[PDB]
Amino acid sequence: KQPIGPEDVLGLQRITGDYLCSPEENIYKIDFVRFKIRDMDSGTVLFEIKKPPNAGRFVRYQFTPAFLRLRQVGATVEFTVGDKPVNNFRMIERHYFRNQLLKSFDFHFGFCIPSSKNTCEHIYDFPPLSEELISEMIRHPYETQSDSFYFVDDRLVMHNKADYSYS
16 A cells, blocks of 8 residues: 555545555554544533444434534544653544545644653634535435544555444
């Protein structure tokens, strides 16, 4: 599998047909152990989970119709890192509905402490979706999908996938 940089995903217009890297390429031993999202306009915790072939790289989310009308959500993530220093840790997450790009989020993690648990907060500013897109997304669960690409020093080290229901 050929090497991937940010420029190779920042212009994608469809969900990838397969994972762009193998689990072994995560040489920094980055392991996400907690994920929580809060609606910034209500303080409501929309979702939270703590860690217990896709090898845990695919996740299915069950959200509500109201999620599609949110303005901003804050995601709190906790992850451990191995002994190798991690510099320029970045995540590019792209969402699509039936192969139509909805929004791409580009986040740079703060300084990552080696050999320990780290915490980061990402602010997601949601795109204002058209009424027809919202109706269709509610009507067709799991046809909304995302690719989350993780890079360390401009090299792809992790690739996760997900699909969503707003029913």
